[PDB]
């Protein structure tokens, strides 16, 4: 995808993440765990439902039209009736093919983007207290217990509290 | 003494193949079908008013072939002509049959 | 039974935007196309393995 996260610096997806589309796994002094990220998951779901609802909205209603099957050879007028219909069908078939190609390219890119946005947001919270290991994981350079991990996950992590400890570990 | 925090996304053992701009087939976690390809094989009688022609064409009902006179003064949203229809009155033709049939049907 | 869309094959659902049942239709109907299937992705790339 365009952002290089999904099938990129994130090496693979997690079959064990069964309660969200995007999320976190951690290891700290209290063990390991996993949690779905609700906001990123819902942003992707909401965009996908948005495009689905635009696509499946409003079939056209048509009533009396032209005949499209014929039991006798007639020549010129029938030739034209059949050509008009064949022309119409080929144009709609082209629209249908192109629509799903464009939509699908974009769905892959928007989901890749949501992964990348979560990663960047997490990085920004951590400031100088962590480093990007290059595989979608952050090495956090301070003791970070379950409540600390949850503070990152819920967006209230206070980098200043841990900065002295982390810098000592990173740089000295 | 520290911790590791990994970001990730879900996956399933087998997803669905779709087409994109650059790929004829690529696997995603889920997709939905946009082409209706099946029918029950029955015409539903609601909400449209359906008139089954049975043994009669619309033109035979129009003219009043006796076995079609059941259809006198009938109305429809959709008239359904059956392949088993037959004429049983004076033999006739209609120059521009298709147009008379169309304008009455409409 | 109830259906907005009628084809000579029978009624069909009209929740999808396209259909490949019959070019002849009456009512609120999906548009006839040649393809017998077209899948709209509703999830991200599935990457269970590297």
């Amino acid at each position: 995808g365009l952002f290089g996260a999904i099938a990129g610096f994130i090496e693979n997806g997690w079959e064990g993440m069964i309660d969200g589309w995007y999320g976190f796994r951690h290891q700290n002094s209290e063990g390991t765990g996993q949690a779905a990220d609700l906001k990123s998951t819902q942003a992707a779901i909401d965009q996908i439902n948005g495009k689905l609802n635009r696509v499946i909205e409003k079939t056209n209603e048509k009533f009396h039209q032209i005949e499209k099957e014929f039991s006798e050879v007639e020549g010129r007028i029938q030739d034209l009736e059949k050509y008009v219909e064949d022309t119409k069908i080929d144009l709609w078939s082209y629209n249908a093919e192109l629509l799903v190609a464009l939509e699908n390219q974009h769905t892959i890119d928007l989901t890749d983007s949501e992964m990348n946005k979560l990663f960047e947001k997490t990085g920004r919270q951590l400031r100088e207290n962590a480093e990007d290991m290059g595989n979608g994981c952050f090495k956090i350079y301070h003791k970070c217990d379950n409540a600390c991990i949850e503070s990152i996950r819920n967006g209230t992590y206070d980098h200043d509290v841990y900065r002295d400890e982390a810098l000592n570990n990173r740089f000295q | 003494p520290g911790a590791t925090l990994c970001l990730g996304h879900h996956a399933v053992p087998n997803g669905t193949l779709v087409k994109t701009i650059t790929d004829d087939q690529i696997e995603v976690t889920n997709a939905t079908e946009l082409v209706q390809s099946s029918s029950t094989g029955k015409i539903c009688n609601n909400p449209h008013r359906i008139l089954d022609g049975i043994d009669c064409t619309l033109i035979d009902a129009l003219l009043g072939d006796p076995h079609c006179d059941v259809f006198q003064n009938e109305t429809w949203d959709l008239f359904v002509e059956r392949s088993k229809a037959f004429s049983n009155c004076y033999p006739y033709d209609v120059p521009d049959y298709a147009s008379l049939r169309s304008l009455v049907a409409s | 039974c109830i259906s907005e869309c009628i084809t000579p094959n029978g009624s069909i659902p009209n929740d999808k935007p396209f259909q490949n049942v019959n070019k002849i239709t009456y009512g609120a109907c999906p548009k006839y196309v040649k393809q017998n299937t077209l899948k709209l992705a509703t999830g991200m790339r599935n990457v269970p393995e590297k």
Partner: antibody, heavy 119, light 109 residues
């Protein structure tokens, strides 16, 4: 402002099945989880399960697993609950309710009017 | 069950009333609590979510809190229109499903 509108009251004989619908009007609910919650006469609320149809999740309470089928039609913006093998223990009002997001943890903030099922 | 509430609470107009909700580690302990209000024969209404968060349409006299494996709904300044059934709720990670308390009937004296 979305409203959830449920199908009408049902009277059912023992062993039969009932399928209740929940239509989202005034907007879609396809990007949210909708749960089904029942309330037996004089009793409390009881979760049956839920569905989040674009996300692709259907969940069931263990106590109803195998007897209930929850489904959705994203094109008509409707969710459904079908409960099989009915007995008098299933006489209850059945509600559909939409969660604040795509999954079942969030508070249920939009509720249908309820559907009475009498067995 | 799973969550346990007193069957009944009462108060006078203007009084402060509290409704308790006892759970376990698999629900209240590790998950967020929601509270619902229900008038007879009508659908429940969301009153509190995420433990202490209040929807904009809900009066500020309603508040919630969570400590350990317990939760509490407080109604400051009781009004007559508050006579209703109240339910606590949370996800349960052991049952893998949503659970509710048995409900508390509030009577305005």
């Amino acid at each position: 402002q979305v409203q959830l509108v449920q199908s009408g009251a049902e009277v059912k004989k023992p062993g039969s099945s009932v399928k209740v619908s929940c239509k989202s009007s005034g907007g879609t609910s396809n990007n949210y989880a909708i749960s089904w919650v029942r309330q037996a006469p004089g009793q409390g609320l009881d979760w049956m399960g839920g569905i989040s149809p674009i996300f692709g999740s259907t969940a069931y309470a263990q106590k109803f697993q195998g007897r209930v089928t929850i489904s959705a039609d994203i094109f008509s913006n409707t969710a459904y609950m079908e409960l099989n093998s009915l007995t008098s223990e299933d006489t209850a009002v059945y509600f559909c309710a939409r969660h604040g997001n795509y999954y079942y943890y969030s508070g249920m903030d939009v509720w249908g009017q309820g559907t009475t099922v009498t067995v | 069950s799973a969550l346990t509430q007193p069957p009944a609470v009462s108060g006078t107009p203007g009084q402060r009333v509290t409704i308790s909700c006892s759970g376990s580690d698999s629900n209240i302990g590790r998950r967020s609590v929601n509270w619902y209000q229900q008038f007879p024969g009508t659908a429940p209404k969301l009153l509190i979510y995420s433990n202490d968060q209040r929807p904009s349409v809900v009066p500020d006299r309603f508040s919630g809190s969570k400590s350990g494996t317990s939760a509490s709904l407080a109604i400051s300044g009781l009004q007559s229109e508050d006579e209703a059934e109240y339910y606590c709720a949370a996800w349960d990670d052991s049952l893998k499903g949503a659970v509710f308390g048995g409900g508390t009937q509030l009577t305005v004296l």
